[PDB]
């Protein structure tokens with residue numbers, strides 16, 4: 001045991017109702033909206049292939065010139081109520097919103113900088129409009145916050161002098177102020193998801209990360225805080241020097257997911273994954289033909305994968321400069337929505353089932369020990385292999401949509417062949433099992 005003052009706080013998984021809710025939600029959407037939406041990946045006639053929200057970096061644009069985009073910020077098609085309806089129709093139980101990205105432009109009228117929605121032609125408090133609209137639909141709201149801030153010159157990448165230390169100490173107070181502001185202006189917030197905490201300046205200031213966590217939990221009862229915020233005394237991030245998880249949930253699976261056979265360790269803690277529709281674009285990019293774009297079933301597969309291993313999944317959207325969503329994103333949300341409406345009993349409020357992974361797809365476990373087989377790969381054998389843990393038998397199988405009974409044949413001790421449905425469902429589908437222990 002190494003002694004640590006700013007290491008892990010939590011024991012195991014939080015089991016208060018607020019965390020249970022965060023967990024049971026399972027499916028979320030991510031919104032990346034900021035000034036980067038205006039150029040849409042293009043600067044000075046040149047289209048850059050990197051992530052559009054990092055365009056300031058790719059095109060080497062100075063802060064003053066970048067933040068001048070505020071003068072064109074006028075999303076006349078924006079309508080918080082439509083956005084919330086879209087999220088509702090997709091089947092998302094929560095939404096995570098970029099309050100401020102690396103660029104430093106704030107979607108709420110912060111008192112602590114001039115780079116906010118207030119100083120734009122649009123003027124209005126976008127974030128407040130969204131919080132109300134989503135909450136009205138019964139959708140929880142979570143706040144993305146970039147610690148790294150390219151708009152504030154007291155920011156430092158590292159601490160190489162007392163001068164740097166002085167500047168950065170001012171920067172951390174500025175940050176605390178924005179955070180307190182967010183927590184008190186918008187007290188229904190359920191989570192803060194920190195990003196841009198990877199620089200050596202932050203790694204050297206673990207105490208501040210632990211402080212930010214404590215500060216926000218005092219202000220917002222039951223609020224959740226991601227692991228990404230946190231560094232310990234030694235600069236170890238996410239998990240501390242004694243290997244204990246910091247924050248309330250693990251938050252490293254970004255555009256990738258744990259292996260279903262090798263990474264079972266993740267079922268021991270809460271966690272949340274996020275993903276993009278193209279290969280790597282979070283903010284709006286005008287040309288999606290530049291990388292592979294996932295199909296709905298590919299996205300659905302990742303959602304169920306996450307849940308099968310006891311984690312949440314958040315699918316990202318990068319709204320247009322005008323405040324509307326591109327056609328591809330509307331189609332995606334609608335498709336995910338249709339499927340969740342039919343099969344979401346195997347997703348919402350479900351968890352790791354403790355069964356050995358099989359090739360046809362994923363198991364999930366319901367709140368009353370339902371075991372759901374979510375089938376993505378249809379075997380030509382017409383038989384779906386189910387190997388049970390010790391002491392578990394399978395008493396019945398049922399097609400979720402129709403209620404029809406599905407033949408279960410015992411092949412060996414602890415193994416069965418569950419038949420495919422008489423009629424091929426033509427899409428990833430669910431069979432529900434009734435199981436019994438000894």
Ligand SMILES: C#C[C@@H]1N[C@@H](C)[C@@H](O)[C@H]1O
Nearest residue numbers: 051053054195254274282
């Ligand atoms: C890097 C990086 C950032 N982290 C992802 C969640 C996006 O915000 C991306 O731009």
